[PDB]
Each structure stands twice: as structure tokens, then as C-alpha cells.
RNA sequence: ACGCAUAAAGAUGAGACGCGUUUUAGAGCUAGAAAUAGCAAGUUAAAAUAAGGCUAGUCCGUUAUCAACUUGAAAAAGUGGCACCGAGUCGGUGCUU
DNA sequence: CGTTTGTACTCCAGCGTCTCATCTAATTGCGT
DNA sequence: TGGAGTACAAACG
């Protein structure tokens, strides 16, 4: 018999339906097996799979990189301890050890409690003399006396461990923090160079530039307000180049500097400024201006006093906190004695004592303390500081995120240079320590694997271990840098194994220009004319017009080659460029000038050709750049056999374009078959979009194949799919390739099965036209009905009685039975919640390491179960230790399944069970389905919780009525329909009571939440008087009691009603467990009451 | 002015920064039998950031895939009759296994 | 009297900013 | 979101 399949793909559901030539759905008597006494069930060919949505890989990468950074930060300190290790034995042979025993409780320490000095008086003196680390950093920088080696190490480790951002290149001159006023010096120098004496207006201080939020709008407005400059060089158009990345990247200035580019004042600036060098300070002052605007912004100290600006800022940031605390204590105690014992003694409010010791941030502390400062007398300076957001600040606060590492380098350099003459091993290791601080792995070399990585691409110049001091002697940077881009670039589609040509490659240029000119006709343009036209026009003219100059040449005798011309300007040797014996040299150059960007690999690669052309040409070309990868490889256009490029260069009927030349002639048709070559699990990688659709496609294929398997393996006639978009074009190919695997008398496909695709406008119009209204809040049958209607409308459209069929449509929409299925799944993810709880005496705490007992150290909490196993055994009951037989359900967590699947018997024994019976172990994943009396179903959600399992089969008349009242005004859309709709809905009201009765009966049968039903009924009785719309708007909310899935709270007009949480897992240990196939038609029932 | 480089959505990979938690170290004092009472103080550091693994690397550990049962180490293959009259989570009648 | 267990009721969970590279695919400024 | 954890009072031996 003929039939068709309808489908409806989604992000969380896949409706499937089967219809014969008549639009009704067939039914069959499917067999069941197990230890039950049932043998058959009769089911309808309708269903709807449901599943959990997939997710993106981002959140895993964001932790993988963090794991790498934590694995490297320990190695840096390991190197530094190694350097000190030869001498530290003469001072404190255990210093590095107490620093590791520091974390753990006093009972488990092997050495003394005090980390630094190991005895009480010295530790107290140390904390008395240097209240923070910064008072030590500054002391070491500003001193000429021998420091103790422990202090030097402790200061150095702080900077090597915390080292600031690497985002600024070149040097920073520390004293430029003082010279922020040099705006007048800038305009002065601009006046000296531009002797026309531009405006020297000084009425606006640089302070307004530094203090403001100097966005482009603010920068421009403030700059133009202070200087209506007579030329752009004195205003924003140049000062942006002087203080920010250039928006005028081209034509940065027209008068000086060759009219050439500058971009963002990188380290490359020192050579990009050669345009100014060749034709000339206006451009020198930018350096000091930027240094000033940075340092004077971050540093609150004029550095003329000291070499260590940051240590000098933080001391003042500490002193003001002390001086304000001592004042505020006195004021609060004098004016409000009742608040003193709250603010300064609590640890729960947002007060000061709740800001140090609690978790309170700066923002909420100010929010709390503003009023007490405001209404009290004499606090004006505190109000000023608070409005500036500099009141009671901590040193290591959240906003240190902008300090650059040159400051740390400058401090460390002097720290070494003051002490090296007393401790010789520092003298010959300075270059090593400073290297440890500054060393960084380049972004294109990647992980330093040895072949085991799934990610790495690095290649080695030697088989040796990498350290900071010999990185470039072991990694071969050129090969890694090339592979970095070669890894990601895609392959040629026509022969899927060779790399693609760059867009600017010269062979590609010839190919394109020949393919263009061969189509010129007047009769096709013969070969000698090809040579003449190309040599005259395309090798001389920088933009040959499409039309005119060809006609000019024609009348004289009787789309661009850009890279050729750019090379012609870069190197003037005409016959060096225009020679075949140099084509394979220049092609490498055109590749290098697009494969690299860092201006070091280009030196690395071009250097072999330095003899072949003079210095100036080489230095000019080194700065050139190209970008873009094309479509075709070398093998497809040339080399493979005369080649195709030769045929294009030939004369006669070879003028046929590539796309036709390769296609018609067997001699060149041969390539497309000789290397023509794939399963779904890698074809799916070609699909664009998020994984959320890939999952739906994958499930849809399985559903289709298994439906075909059920139906006696006769192929379906038509398949209708639903989501001008590529994805729905790809899915059609995915289905039809598998379906039509059959070949005709010409060895090509036979269309056994047709694939069709629709758009939702038709089905929505059908809904509105024939009043098959959909309400999304009641039950999950809409997926199946949608799929069925898709199949109906698609088959009707492709075949093309409405006065006869609608009865069948009505009944199949009204059928009570629909094969809803939820996909079982083993859980994957993190072991437990991340928050490290404080120590508690409860035993739920999970140890954070092997030998850190949670009772003393705290730890994680609330782990997650992977799957649950039914176990039957004997357990030791009572003080008399009776080995009572027990049947029990146990949960296996993600952390444990590795051991469990390795050895179930010893794990179940370690749980405490004795004499467990092996073959009675069952695996029960999440969402396993159980059936109990009266059809009361429950799904497992964990070892100790359940979920509902039933669908409410509300009749069609009620959903039809509720549709006409869930929307009243917006639903109208037309007066002639509205009048009769209003006349209809008004003439009966008892349907509200019918809905209440239905919900009450269904809840009494299967939900068993009677208290909430009583509350609902009482509230409905209370509000019976309200108009019909007000009733309906919350009657729609009322079905949240009966819907499938985990229970959740909802609200009724004034009353919130809380969720009921089933927990009685014990009631299930004797229910009929159901195993289902994906479609749900094939079933297996295990009766747990026959076991144990 | 039709044109395409464009911004504005994503997908994937690599390189660095700033915080936040947890446990110790920073000798609280006085009057009282104690409970309690009065006052003083507060800003920093070390160690860990999925338990761990063997391939021993400056490497790997949260994405994707997964009813039963027979065979197969596994991949993988294979295993469940039809017509008719009716509907409250699917029934019944008939034929043939 | 002592124990297990059943219901109703809270309170809760790691986060923000940089640089670089490739791809797809639908969009618009105003190129002239 | 929806699941683990704490604190509370009644049925059963």
C-alpha cells in the first residue's frame, strides 16, 4: 500500500506522522515481550519525540585555557626557586617547605607554624615594620644596604607571580607622569615647525583632557573647543594619531611625511615613521603625551621623589584610609552612640565591619554609609571623597587591571642592581630572572606538545625539552608559523586533498584574464591577437577598461592584472618579472606576502633572495602585504594533462571557458571522476548554524529509517520536511541521497522517493481558515498534530475533497492516543557545585583533595548523579546485626562511574551491601518510565525525586472555546467575524465549570495534590463573579498543575500557589518498568515485583 | 547611477590580565567564679582552583555520541503477521502464523 | 518511651576586560 | 530553571 511520512523538525521536538493515500492513519497490533503476562498492544501511527537541547563548546575552552595558565604559573615559581636553591640552603634549608605546609591545619604541619621566620617575635616584628608588601618593595628599591635573602625572594616572587598586562609595547619612561602639562609644549613645537604661527590658545588646561572620559566625542569636542586650529595638524585629526589609534590611517597628514600611513603607534612605528624621516618635533611629542596620559592617570605620585611610583601610590592609598577611619570613629561615637555598636561590631550588615570581614563590596558600603555621613555634622570632606569614589579604599582592589608590566620591570631592575654586589649569583643571573618575567609563548606556536595532543601543531628543530632560555633554538618558528594558517584553510572542492591558491597569485591572474578574453568575439579572438592585446593593454595599463581600448586597438590595426603592475612598481626590472624562469621564484614571494603578518617571518623567508635584487627594492617589498585565499588549486588549472591553461592560451575551439572545457572533453572530464572521492557523522560537519539544529537533523534521520523498518521496508512515496535558507536545502539532500540509492540504464540515480519542503504560512492559514486553533499551554499533542497537518497539506499540494475529508481531520485531531516519548540520557558535566563552603560537621561535604578531610577544611557540596542502579542484597540491620534482605535503589555520581564500570561488585560492597546477586543489577538512566496502578506513571529524575508522566486529553470543544477567550481584542482582526464570535462565546458560561471538573477529576486520579486543588477551587469560587476574559486569562495559567515534566509554581488572580515536589521514590520499587524504542512502538516490560 | 567592501550576526582555535572563595600566619586588653560588661584593632601574604591519568609531555580531564536481547573484543549486523467494527491514554471481532 | 519517616517551608548556586587567526551568511553605505 | 540541603512534627514499634 502507498503511504507518506510527514515531519516537523525543531530545537526540542521532532513530530512524526504516517498517512496512507486516504488521509487517515493506520494502526497495527504490536507485540511486547518480557516477564509480564501481556503479549500485545494496539497503537496508532502518530507520535512526538522530545529531547534536551545541545550546547556550544565555548564554556569548555574557557576552562581549558585556564587550566593551561595555572599549569604554567607554577612552573615560573619553580624556576625561580631553582635559581635560589643553591644559596638558600645556607640561610634556611626549609624555607621553600614551610611555604607548602602553610595551608594545612596546625596538627598536620611538620615544621613550625610561622611561614617566614619560624618564630613568634620575628614574625610580629616583620608585620609591625612592613604592614603590607608595598612597604617592602619601596624599601628595597630605595635603599643601599644588604637585604636578607628571604625578603628579596619574597619581593621578587610577588612580581613574577603577578605581572600586569602585556598589551603595551616599547618602553615607558617613568618620569612622563609629571609632564602631562606638555600640551603647551606640543603647540609650541607645532608653532616652531609650522612657522605661520598657529593659534597658541592656552585657556584650557591639559587637566580637562586627562580627567575626562576621553572618548572620541569628548576628545574631539574638548580639543576643538580649546583649539579652533587653523590647520588639521593642531587639532583632533592629528592629535588622534598623537594619542590614539588612527582613524585617518591613510593620509595621516598631507604636508609632511610623504602623505603616507600610520595606524596605531606600534613598535613598527619606529620604521613606519620613515615617511616623515624622508621629507622633514610634531610627531615626537606623541610619545611623551601618551606616556603622560597613561602614567598620570594611573599614578597618584610625582615620581621625581622616587624610582618606584606604584609602591609610592599604594602607601598613600593606605594612609588616607587610616586617617579617615580614625576621624569617622570619633564623629559617629560623638553624635550617634546607638549606631557605633552596629557599624563597627556587626558582620552581617553593609557597614564597615561587614565590609572588611563580610563579603560586602565597595559600592554597597558607600550606598549604606552615605546617609550617616550626610545628616551628621562636619563630614563635608568625607562627602567630597565619597563623591570622588576614593573613600576607605583597599590596596589590592578590583580596578588594578590596567597597570603595564614595564613598571614591574623598572622596579625589579633596581631591586637587582642595589643588591647584586653582596649576593654574586644575582649578578650573573639578572638576564635570566628578567627573562622569566618577560618571556611569553607566541600566539601562533600553540601548545608545546609531543604528539599526544589533539590540538597542537608545533614542529621541532630538535628532540629536546623547552625552557625559557632556549625556546627559539628548539622550536623551528618558520614551520610552526606556516602550519598555523595552513591548518585552518580549506581544501579545493574539486580534488579534496590539495591546498588552494592565494587570490593575488599570478597564475590565477593569467587564468582569469585568459578566461575573460577568450569569450571576446567579432570570429573568436585568435591566439596572436591574444598575445598582442595582453602585451599592449593588460601588461601596461593599471585599469584596462572593459570595452573601449579593445575597440581602439581594433581601429588602430584596421578584469585586471593588478599584481603584475604592483610588482612592476615595486621592482622595476621588467624582464625579471616577465620571465618564466623567474615565475617559480616570484610565486613564492606572492605566497609569503600573504601567509605572514608579523614582519619577522617575512625577513626569515625572503633573505635567501637578497642577492638577486638590490637593497632598496627588497626593503620596499618587505613592507608590502596582501590578503585573501581563492577557489582553485594549481593542479586543477595547470600541470595536469597540454594543460588546461595551455588550452586557454591555445587558438581555435579551445577558447571554451574552463567550466565548459573541463566539462565536455573526456580528456579533461577525467579529473572530476579520477579523484571524486563521507557518512552522516562527518557530512553533518558541513552544515552551518548552531548544534541545536544538527541534533534535530540527526534524530530525524534515525526516526525516518526506523519508521521505514517498521512498515515492511517498502519505500515511502513522499517525505515532507519543515523547520530560501541553505539548511533546509541540505536536509533534502541528506534524505534523498539515502532514499534514492538506485541506478538506471545510464548508471545514474533513479528517483524512487521525492523530498518536498513547505513554509509555515500555508499551515497557519489553514489553521485560521478551518478553526483548528492551537493552544500551547494544555498538552504536548500539538507537535504530532503539526506534523500530521504538514503531511496532509504537502501531499494535497503536490497531488493538485474539502467537503468530505474534514470529518477525518477532526477525528484524527481528536484521537486520545499519541506516542509521546522522552529521550533517556546519561548525564555529563562537572562533578558538583563550585562554591567552596565553609567547614561544617555534616557528612555531605566532598573532599577537595585526597588528604583534606572536609570536617576540618571545608569542601564542595551537592554532587550530581549520572545514573541509578537497582540493587538487591542483604544489609546489617539493628544492634543485633540482622542480615535482612532488602531491595533498594542506589545512585551513581559522575565522579564514580569510572570505578563502577571497572568493578561493580567491589563498589556495591563498599556501599555496604552484602551478598548482592549479580545478574539482578539493572541500569536506570534519567527519565526512566515506571507504570503503577490506574495508569499513574512516574519518571525517574534522580535517586530521590520523581516527575509527572501523564498527558491531559482535553476534548476539542474546550480548547476551541478557550482559544476564543485567551485573546479578546487582539484576536478580532475583523468586525464581521467578531460579531458572530462574540454572539457565540456569550451564550454559554458553564464551560468554566466543565474545565474545573475535568482538572479536578484528572488530578484526583493521577496527580494526588489535593490540597492545591482545594486552594484552586476555593479561589475560583471566590472570583466566580468576574467577566469571562478575566477568568480565561488565569484559567489558561491553571493547567500548569497537570502538565508533564517537573512541577513548578504559578499564580491565580491574587493567590500564589507553590509547587508540590514528589519525593516518595520507595513507592516505585514494585512497579512495571517500561523499556521503549525511540519511536516507542517496540516495547519491553520488566516487572520488578518478580525479583527480590 | 549597480556595484561590493562592508558591518554585524554568529562558529572554531590559540595567547595574556584583574578579582572572588577555602584553611592557616598576623601574641586583643581590663573587671569579674563564670555567663557577661566595657574599651582597643581592621587594608597584607603563602597554598589550591574540578578528584586525578600515563603516553611522563611546560601533555590530557565539563562539547558531540548512548531502549532491550542474540552474535561479534568492538565497530557493526540481526531479531516483533494481516483485515474489519469502535474510542478516555487504546480496545474488541475475524483470518493466518 | 524511642525511632523512622512523612509533609510543608525556606534559601541557593564563580565573573569582568584585552590581542590574533580562519570560515559562513545575510546586510547595507554610498562607493562616484 | 528545578534539584540538592536544612529544619519540623506525626505514624509506628
Swiss-Prot record:
One biological process term in Gene Ontology: maintenance of CRISPR repeat elements
Database matches in PROSITE patterns: HNH_CAS9 (PS51749)
Highest taxon listed in the record's lineage: Bacteria
Keyword Nucleotide-binding attached: no
Consequence recorded when altering residue 163 to A: Moderately decreased DNA cleavage
Region of interest called RuvC-I, as start-end residue ranges on this chain: 1-60
GO MF: 3'-5' exonuclease activity; DNA binding; DNA endonuclease activity; metal ion binding; RNA binding
EC number(s) per entry: 3.1.-.-
Stated regulation of activity: Only has nuclease activity when bound to both gRNAs (crRNA plus tracrRNA), which results in conformational changes in the protein and formation of a central channel which binds target DNA. Also requires interaction with PAM to trigger catalytic activity. Nuclease activity is inhibited by EDTA.
Enzyme class: hydrolase
Biotechnology remark: Coexpression of Cas9 with an artificial single guide RNA (sgRNA) which fuses the crRNA with the tracrRNA in human cells has shown it is possible to target and modify DNA sequences of interest. Cas9 plus the 2 sgRNAs have also been expressed individually in human and mouse cells to achieve DNA targeting; cleavage efficiencies of the artificial sgRNA were lower that those for systems with the 2 sgRNAs expressed separately. Microinjection of Cas9-encoding mRNA and a synthetic sgRNA into zebrafish embryos induces targeted mutations.
Region called ARM, residue ranges: 54-71
Motif (PAM substrate-binding): 1059-1061
Effect noted on mutating residue 13 to A: Decreased DNA cleavage
Annotated spans, RuvC-II: 678-723
Subunit structure: Monomer. Binds crRNA and tracrRNA.
Protein family (similarity comment): Belongs to the CRISPR-associated protein Cas9 family. Subtype II-A subfamily.
UniProt protein name: CRISPR-associated endonuclease Cas9/Csn1
Gene that this polypeptide is encoded by: cas9
